[PDB]
Amino acid sequence: FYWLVILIVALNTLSIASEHHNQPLWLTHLQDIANRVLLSLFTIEMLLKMYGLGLRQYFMSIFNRFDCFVVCSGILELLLVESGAMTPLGISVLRCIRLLRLFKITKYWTSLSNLVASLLNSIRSIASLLLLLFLFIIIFALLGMQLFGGRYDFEDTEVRRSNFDNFPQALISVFQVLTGEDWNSVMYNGIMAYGGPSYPGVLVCIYFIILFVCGNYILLNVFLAIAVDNLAEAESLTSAVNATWFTNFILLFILLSSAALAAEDPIRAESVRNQILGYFDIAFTSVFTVEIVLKMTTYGYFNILDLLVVAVSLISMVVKILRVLRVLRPLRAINRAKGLKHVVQCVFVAIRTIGNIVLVTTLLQFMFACIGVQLFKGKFFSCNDLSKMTEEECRGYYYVYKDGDPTQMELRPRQWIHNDFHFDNVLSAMMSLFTVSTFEGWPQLLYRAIDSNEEDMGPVYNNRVEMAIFFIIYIILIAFFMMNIFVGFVIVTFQEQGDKNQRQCVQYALKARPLRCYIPKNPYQYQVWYVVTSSYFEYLMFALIMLNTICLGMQHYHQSEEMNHISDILNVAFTIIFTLEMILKLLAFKARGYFGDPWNVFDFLIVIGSIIDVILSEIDTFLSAFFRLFRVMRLIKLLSRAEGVRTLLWTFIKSFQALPYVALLIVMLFFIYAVIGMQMFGKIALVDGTQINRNNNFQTFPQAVLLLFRCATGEAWQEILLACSYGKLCDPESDYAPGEEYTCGTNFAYYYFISFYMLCAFLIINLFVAVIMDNFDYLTRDWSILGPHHLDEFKAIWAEYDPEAKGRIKHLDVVTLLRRIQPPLG
């Protein structure tokens, strides 16, 4: 019987999921028939196991305090349609409460059953902080109503929907600045609402700086005191051939045969460079052949991969698909590299566990897609001109006015256009909501949903402002909450795998090594030395850098004939002062104890570069704009002062250096996707006004790699996805048959881009957590108890007395220095 309920709570989801726009009438009939049939069974079996479980203990469980709600609302919705029921306001509520039968699954998965049990008492703990967040938002919405409310009266005809004219609008605008999407154009409208790029007006830019920075700080506090405190407790809840140089050559060779794939003109296939690389490919292919044919003798996954890879390689000389599945070249260096097959094998581990959370958000994405279909189905059509509301009217030509000037018009044909991201079926609604979750172009869907009028009519400006809730609730569920427990399910795959102070402070003393100091000789050399290493000298030389930075900052454009002239002599003055301090230190440290310290080396380089820049810039009037950069990098000498900043930098940089294959995975993903897109999308034309243009295209390999970096950053990745969709112009250099030049691009794009984002979003997280996990002792360090910092203090005090390393010191100095070292160690 239990397995005969899932037969009918699945045949119900498929019912409500088959619903789309313009459906065949037999589908409407089949749908309401299935609804009646299924409500009958729902009620009848509820009652059957009511008398099989008795009234009192049936009411005991949490998930039948709800089932009768289904049983009641279902038939009362059957009945309200049998009344004077009317317009999609009440109707939406009927067909969407009809969806709460999709909530049965979450009770059904029985680990999803308590997942939400944990989720709900994660929020209850933090309700106070999540109330302070709403108070923050409300104060900034009111401050925006005071600053910009009623000031967006620009005389042009551009539409600026994100303003601060009333309270719901100000609230939407502050929420959009918080999600970070298109906040800069809200800032520009606010700068131009005041004067312009002038002194009083550019100070409205601090409303948005404080807004973004402090709002996102508070959001990080909110959604990180839930993945760090409220999923660490669910833990307690649940727990209680073998030649070296030869293979080095073969993996150097894999690299060459993969770099032969990068540099290949997509547009002209008959490039003499592609001709040059065709023979190179077959040479590489014979090489990779004759050294694995020899491998299948010493024996009968990775030893079969290159087996399957060299085949298509030496067969070539379908077509396109079989030159696109030759991208398996980088996927041979996984076995030849120990650490690579260690890392790849270490991430397939963290996939079959974070798969339980990837299936609950997929079902949560699906429920919202069906809600959105029931709200916005058929309502995302519109006309070229917003004056014509139905499709029979939107025909003919109309006038567009250039720059809103009624005396400069031009004719355009008016056409009934569909939004690119709509809610007509469930697949489309799921696509639209996917793009809303990455926070890209979501205000354009919000203001198109607010305008939604009726089933086949164009927008009505600010029709349904209450339709913002649907969006603001989605973003808060998926993009903020369920994303910050997908992150927690990755820490428990990292922090789990790998007293405590005791062994770590016994290791330091056991392996530590002393310093050097280079105390000088020759009382004149000691004389200068004592000045050059004096602390106040190191304050005087840090004042001159803060003074040299201001002088570089005082530069501006379209100045007059006495600011440059003083600038370029102050530059010479500073060059000479820094050279003087350099040679001063050389005289003290005797040129041997000078180059032992890496900051003195980094400073000598800055001196030598900033001297050459002087000559290059002075030769202009005596008989390379990147040499001028050696004046700015003189500012990183300040780092040597900052102890805390330097140790923080080192502690994260060293861990980035000890995790090179997690980053090699991202490099590999970028390489593979940029080689694929150069074949799939490489022949689209570079047109201005489109998203495939001269700055952003797939024609070269660096262009494709920078486009993919742009999509990783999430810039308008869904606007690029819509620029490769088969309706595209083929660029002239390419070889298309005559008449058919609008046949470029693929719908494969939809997979490509969506699989990029997701994968590129997963690895980044993976690389973040990883780097934060091998630093956890430092980031969680109680500075009261003990630490390697005291032991570095001890090394310092030991090296002062004993500059030359030499190990030993004499007992008198030994006991004398004991008073210095603080209680924790001394």
Partner: protein, 100 residues
């Protein structure tokens, strides 16, 4: 000429570092090489620039000479510095400026 003189300067120390326990002397030497490459890069561009104020143009033989010597001198100085500089400490007790 500036670049060539830089490389002359770099070679003297890059050799004099071999005897008398003078390992350290490979740090300035390295840096000098870098600058040579740097100036050579500059050289490239200015000639390129003049080429585009004077017809068909072509960089044929000595351009690849310089665009290889500059690239290799640059990477060689940078790598020689990184091989003369000890190591990013990698452990709580390790230090740049360690004894041996």
């Amino acid at each position: 000429v500036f670049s060539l003189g830089f490389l002359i300067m770099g070679t003297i120390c890059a050799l004099m570092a071999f005897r008398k326990k003078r390992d350290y002397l490979l740090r300035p030497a390295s840096m000098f090489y870098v600058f040579a490459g740097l100036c050579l890069f500059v050289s490239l561009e200015v000639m390129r620039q003049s080429v585009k104020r004077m017809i068909e143009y072509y960089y044929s033989w000595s351009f690849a000479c310089a665009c290889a010597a500059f690239v290799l001198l640059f990477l060689g100085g940078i790598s020689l510095l990184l091989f003369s500089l000890p190591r990013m400490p990698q452990n709580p007790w390790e230090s740049c400026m360690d004894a041996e």
